[model samples]
Target: SMEQVAMELRLTELTRLLRSVLDQLQDKDPARIFAQPVSLKEVPDYLDHIKHPMDFATMRKRLEAQGYKNLHEFEEDFDLIIDNCMKYNARDTVFYRAAVRLRDQGGVVLRQARREVDSIG
Candidate 1:
């Protein structure tokens, strides 16, 4: 349960970060046109569950064992992530920068997980 508690805290912090990022951007530029909606759907849940890189690594392994072939295997998840963050970059340059930062942080986690999975074989 303690792990769950920490996860909740991490999720809250991450959500707060995204909100703060969006707010700061809005503050700096009021008339900026937004092509993409500033919405975070399942992203918060994903971030909360995988609060650590190893958590992702473990999940990745489980998915593979269960029959996930490639990135497309998690297409829906990636789509949500892109829609929530990556897609906004083109619409709002500031948010794009922030999204990239977020993606990079998650990337490191995925990369580490992949390495762990690969080492198994």
Candidate 2:
């Protein structure tokens, strides 16, 4: 019972740390394209093509909602955003290149978050 309370306290701080990680990612994507869901009307087949779609828009809401219970869960959603992009677009396309670049930059952000988390623990 005591540990349950302790876990909640830890998670509260963890989500705060993760916000910094997400802010950097949004900056990395200055166009704000990844901030929202791909318009189904724009790409009617997007959901059909990529079965799992993840975006910063939803991620932000979930972060606030505490839907991501752990750091790993947050990371999974972040990775899924890039993974979905790469899968939906061919390598020759700009979308594919964007995913590659984003992934490369996100690595640095993720590592920084992990280091900060380690320090806190």
Candidate 3:
């Protein structure tokens, strides 16, 4: 419970820090349209409404073209997307999390295959 509380505090602080950065950026470029800041509580549902259906097959192909061969290679790319989503006040979507789950499942399948192979050997 303490750890979760600490994590939430850090996340809240991160949100404030990012909002400050966006505010400064808007000031530096007055003509650009920056998104309005959102509360952490609203981020989920707000993002849900704006999320586009992502086809993993297409996504995988696109990432591969961009030289993403493994989960680690794609991890930063995912993080970048999440960061941008927050900046745009559209951090509500579960698409990125689903992709991570799929990647994790792939790891489990690979591990199972390895175990089976080892048993046969």
In angstroms, give how far residue 62 of model 1 lies from its true place.
12
Highest lDDT model number: 2
Best by TM-score: 2
Model 3 ranges with Cα > 4 A deviation = 33-121
- Cα error, candidate 2, residue 86 (Å): 0.7
Q: Write the per-residue lDDT of candidate 1 for residues 59-83, one digit (tens) a residue.
A: 3344434434333344334334434
Which pairs of residues collide in model 3?
Answer: none
Candidate 2 segments exceeding 4 Å error? 1-3
lDDT of every model, 2 decimals: 0.42, 0.86, 0.40
- Models sorted by TM-score, best on top: 2, 1, 3
lDDT score of residue 66 within candidate 3:
39
Two-way TM-score contest, 1 vs 3, winner? 1
TM-score-superior candidate, 1 or 2:
2
Pairs clashing within candidate 1? none
lDDT (tens digit, per residue) of candidate 2 on 1-121: 9999999988888888888888998788876668898889899988878888999999999998767777799999988889998998899998878888888998988887888888887
lDDT of 3 by residue, 1-121 (tens): 9998876665554444333332332343232222233334756565554443222233344443434423343334434433444444333545434334444443444454445434633
Candidate closer to the true structure by lDDT (higher is better), 2 or 3: 2
